[PDB]
């Protein structure tokens, strides 16, 4: 407990409190920096006030400001709220405000992050498709499995090297129909995940084998339209890619659709002949 008192203020990294060039020459800096200067200036002015000679009232006066300042970076608002000069009566984000905040750190650390091998398009019923697979726009597969394709291009005559294979595809009109044959080969036994708008239960994400197809839409199987609450009036599903051989292993072993047929809530099936199937089978 002798540490709760502060005499040495840790300063946050620099690139974490950027100074950046914008438009015209506008700049942008982490609010933290205006707070740091506060402290530094006060701490300095303090020193010089002690050295110049010291009239009590003024030394405390400063010591006070100083204190307040030390609050500011740590946590703003607990005692009064600091402001950037006339423009925005906004609480300069205090380190605290960083961790907690309306949308802070641990917080948004769990709201989400953006996956690197992701995609999203409109969905459309794939009646012939089997639970096992799903229809994925080749055009999409291409970007998705880009690196996996690049190398595969090199293993075949389509390109000499990566950088080559890259420029080879940088434009749409340049793709030889040999590339599709390469991608279709890369995706042989790999599978991807599909998500739905509200992911409410584990089946809110399921794995399937892609069967590349033309156009824009994503072919989804009808039987799993019940797990994800997805109807076809514009519902769009995202799609992710299992990169490690492990992530893929699990993905297709314990996360593929045709393996999780019975719900976790009830030992009742969730792969049941939905609407159109019954109607048929009944008549």
């Amino acid at each position: 407990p002798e540490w709760m008192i502060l005499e040495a203020v840790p300063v946050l990294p620099p690139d974490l409190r950027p100074m950046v060039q914008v438009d015209g020459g506008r700049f942008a800096t982490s609010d933290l920096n205006d707070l740091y200067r506060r402290l530094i200036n006060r701490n300095n002015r303090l020193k010089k006030l002690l050295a110049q000679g010291a009239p009590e009232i003024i030394i405390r006066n400063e010591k006070r400001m100083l204190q307040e300042a030390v609050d500011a970076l740590l946590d703003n608002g607990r005692r009064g709220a600091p402001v950037t000069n006339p423009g925005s009566d906004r609480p300069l984000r205090s380190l605290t405000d960083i961790l907690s905040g309306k949308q802070g750190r641990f917080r948004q650390n769990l709201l989400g992050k953006r996956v690197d091998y992701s995609g999203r398009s409109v969905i459309v019923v794939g009646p012939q498709l089997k639970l096992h697979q799903c229809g994925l726009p080749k055009r999409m597969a291409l970007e998705l499995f880009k690196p996996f394709l690049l190398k595969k291009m090199e293993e075949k005559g389509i390109a000499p090297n990566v950088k080559a294979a890259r420029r080879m595809l940088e434009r749409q009109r340049d793709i030889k129909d040999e590339v599709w044959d390469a991608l279709e080969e890369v995706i042989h036994g790999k599978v991807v995940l599909l998500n739905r708008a509200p992911t409410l239960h584990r089946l809110g994400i399921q794995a399937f084998q892609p069967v590349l197809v033309e156009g824009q839409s994503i072919q989804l199987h009808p039987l799993v339209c019940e797990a994800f609450n997805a109807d076809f009036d514009g519902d769009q599903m995202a799609v992710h890619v299992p990169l490690s051989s492990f992530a893929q292993a699990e993905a297709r072993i314990q996360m593929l659709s045709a393996h999780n047929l019975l719900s976790p809530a009830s030992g009742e099936p969730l792969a049941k002949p939905s609407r159109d199937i019954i109607l048929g089978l009944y008549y």
Partner: peptide, 12 residues
């Protein structure tokens, strides 16, 4: 409480 008044009072 609030910082200006206190010093004002302080030296005044």
């Amino acid at each position: 409480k609030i910082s200006t008044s206190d010093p004002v009072r302080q030296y005044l």
